[PDB]
Swiss-Prot record:
The modification N6-acetyllysine is found at K41. Residues 8-83 form the H15 domain. It is found in: Nucleus; Chromosome. This is Heterochromatin protein 1-binding protein 3. The modification Phosphoserine is found at S6, S7. It comes from Homo sapiens (Human). A central region that included the first H15 (linker histone H1/H5 globular) domain binds at the entry/exit site of the nucleosomal DNA. Component of heterochromatin that maintains heterochromatin integrity during G1/S progression and regulates the duration of G1 phase to critically influence cell proliferative capacity. Mediates chromatin condensation during hypoxia, leading to increased tumor cell viability, radio-resistance, chemo-resistance and self-renewal.
Amino acid sequence: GPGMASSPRPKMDAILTEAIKACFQKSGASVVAIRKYIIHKYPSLELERRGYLLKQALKRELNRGVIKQVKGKGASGSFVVVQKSRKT
């Protein structure tokens, strides 16, 4: 585009979003799940292992409401609670 020196948008956010949404139900999503994922799935685990990016994201949900809330409770897609408890 019009302007050299540029960096793409982050993706790790969705990579883990898939884990909580897709995994939490199929395999379950916990602090270890995200950690072991960075460790086993990626090399970045060195820095990430400090549960900085992943734990903050995974735990931010848990710390917010036990990661049992994907969407809002009204204006959003109705009362939603992950795949394990994806209400209607």
